[model samples]
Target: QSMSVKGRIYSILKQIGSGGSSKVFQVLNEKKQIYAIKYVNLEEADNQTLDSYRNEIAYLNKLQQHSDKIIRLYDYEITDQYIYMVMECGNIDLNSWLKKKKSIDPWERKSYWKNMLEAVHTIHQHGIVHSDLKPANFLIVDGMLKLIDFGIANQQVGTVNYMPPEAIKDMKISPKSDVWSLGCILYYMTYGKTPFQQIINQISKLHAIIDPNHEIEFPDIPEKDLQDVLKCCLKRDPKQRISIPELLAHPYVQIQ
Candidate 1:
């Protein structure tokens, strides 16, 4: 589908991807610039989900100008039976990006980790919590990590691999909750798996063992600084999880 909004015409390049409720398209404008357009059928949206969609749009608009770490939102429009979003496109998601590389080198991991941390901190400072954070939700644009998706995620219970224990127990998603998710993503970067993938593989009975009362297993990595960062994040108690300011203070997550 092609659309003319703000006097610029955008033609659909193709369907790039989709969540259960929305289809994301690659679109190019008359000016020959690339953007991604996402459309969700209103039929599938709950009233709560609808509000979060608009919230994300307004939040992205505010961040587009000042933040280098977040995705840029050009414009968006909503309608009777559908809602649409138009914004800058990404090179690939971190999940897919990691697959082509053999493994992360030390400094390279630090760079990516720092970028990811900066992006999360940007939102946290604004009092917004992106409950749905997975490697796929972090897109790579020009080699810098940009956090994608806000508020509206199909994962009602959160992503199994990255969810904090409290998120599974109650529906509580705080900044600390996202901190656990960051550790899960970093663990994947370090060891090619999430911290709970082994027990989570014991599906259907996941919440039985994935509780905050359950312990997180740390795989042996010879580096103290990196492992320490993960430990600070994966604490079973949200009270103990690292705050964004405290996390960015870590030497491992700071970069010029």
Candidate 2:
């Protein structure tokens, strides 16, 4: 069950989306402004999931002073049953946005990638690691890319397909883990599919990823500079992976 706001004139315009532990709503404030409210039922959430919710709130509060690439958290209301976060609304997520486009323009991809890297860099600068990094976690609003869903931020948590080898082993998450996920996101943007979709088992995929000579097939990016950046981010060794600063300086990202 979702929680309700009391003593306020807010009303749910529509249900925006939902996930395993929470539901998002397109709500209207008393002033008639539109906002997105994410409601998490504390009673139903397991300890780990509850921790993630708290972590998200904590990180977003800290990031309030940083980059605009992340979704804005305006206010929050907590009740005995639920934790509700009021945030800026976006049109769609990256996954939906990609589906609408027959082919992503190279320059547009470069721009999005640069913005994403800058956002990640800003979070890292504040010692926050977005453990869960995927296309669905990025929202497009007003033609700009904004990162969202930091539920697992700064935790050793992530989607298996996007996780680096070190991350799968439960190693300490760092900015490099995010770089690995960024590589996966770039791959998805370029090819409309993840790099490790062929492998079934998570363990098998991890093995292949850790293999030094494992070669990933790419569907024709045409741009050598872009391809190089992808390869650099996907490096098996975290230490060898490209840093966000290095990625921002890469020629492809620098293309204006």
Candidate 3:
């Protein structure tokens, strides 16, 4: 069951979207300011899920000052029914944004990757790991990227498809787990599809099939720089993958 709580004339507005754990509504504040009010359902959540939400709140609140990647939590209220978080809203995510573009340009892809990498590095510096990193979890507001969906995310094992082969096997996660997710996002940005789908068609059905030789198949992108970056991030052996600092120094970023 779901519960509804109303505030003082917050301007009844349209529902923008909903996810597994929360629903986002587009509303205007008293001063005629627009915001996204995310309502988190406590009833639908288990103890583990609740812990994840609390961890996200604590982590994001602490890290908000250090990095602009996170969505700022303006207000929060909890009642018997639900918990609500008021935050800045964005138009759409990278996954949805990519649908409109025919093909992602090489330079544009590099720029996007760099911005996200900076954010991920900042998170790592704070001793936080964004276990869930994907296109849908990033917002593109005013053409700038901001990370979203801290809920259902913790400093735990990374999500299924994006986690590295080792992490998937051993259920261990670290900052490098995010690097794997980042690489998957980059692959999606260029291909307009998840690596999972492609793998299912080509190889046996599984959660993640790491293939070192799997070319990301963006013919437009010059192979000189992006190819190596992609390979390094998607390496099956996590130890050999490039670290965050090293990723920032890649040629794709150096020339930019």
Candidate 4:
């Protein structure tokens, strides 16, 4: 069937996903090209929240100039009640892609990690921190990774499980914080769960993060080089964490 968005008609393919504030739909244009429409309802949004949405759009616009690894924003519209962004369509999100597979080959893992690091590096070069880097936020498009969902991206905004200790304490989000989240993503990719999955309490998780004695147990990752890279990324001290360039040059990431 067809639906009207901002007086423009689009053939609704299906609803892709939804969250508390927004709904994502797969729609078709007159050219028969597929696009993902992200519609955000701001009826209850406060001034600060609306500003955050604006920031997301601004960040997306800035990113459009820098990297091909990010989702392309084709167009956007803002009315009194809703904000809509039309984006490039993708086959599947990284989380769903991973779920369909029992395990990833080391070579494929290396490639994915390399692409992710490169994408993150590009944004960091422009002084943009992803803040929230997780499997769900990454989309697999035409056998390549495309980073999406900058709605919660800032120097301080992040998902609880992926956030670094520095962010949890002082809200100081840096590239290192993103690195920590990358580490968490790596861990999840290997083990199918986050390092802090067992800890449900937010405060306890924070304590675990800050506790130097607390160890992150890995689930038998086959490659030692990969394990080393994870260790470097997951360092509790942001000062001690590995930089993006260093990670790119690391032996594991360099492997074919």
Best by TM-score: 4
Stretches of candidate 1 off by over 4 Å are: 43-46, 153-158, 200-215, 219-222
Which candidate, 2 or 3, would have the higher TM-score against the true structure? Answer: 2
TM-score against native, each model: 0.86, 0.87, 0.83, 0.88
RMSD of each: 2.9, 3.2, 4.1, 3.0
Q: Report the lDDT tens digits of candidate 1 across residue range 30-134.
A: 888999988878786787777777677778888766578788778877775787788789999888888677888887788888888888888877887887688
Top lDDT hit: 4
Better of 2 and 4 by lDDT: 4
Q: Say which prediction, candidate 2 or candidate 4, comes out ahead on TM-score.
A: 4
lDDT of 3 at 200: 44
Compared with the true structure, all predictions reach lDDT values of: 0.78, 0.80, 0.71, 0.82
User: Any idea what lDDT model 3 has?
Assistant: 0.71
Please write out the lDDT profile of model 3 over residues 1-256, one tens digit for every residue: 2223355446648888776666778888777878887887787677776777777777777778877777677777776467787778887878778767788777677777877988888888977777777777788877678787553442212335565666556745778888888997887776666566555443342343655555444445555687677778877777887889999988878884
Candidate with better lDDT, 2 vs 3? 2
Best of the two (1, 3) by lDDT:
1
Model 4: per-residue Cα lDDT at residue 165: 81
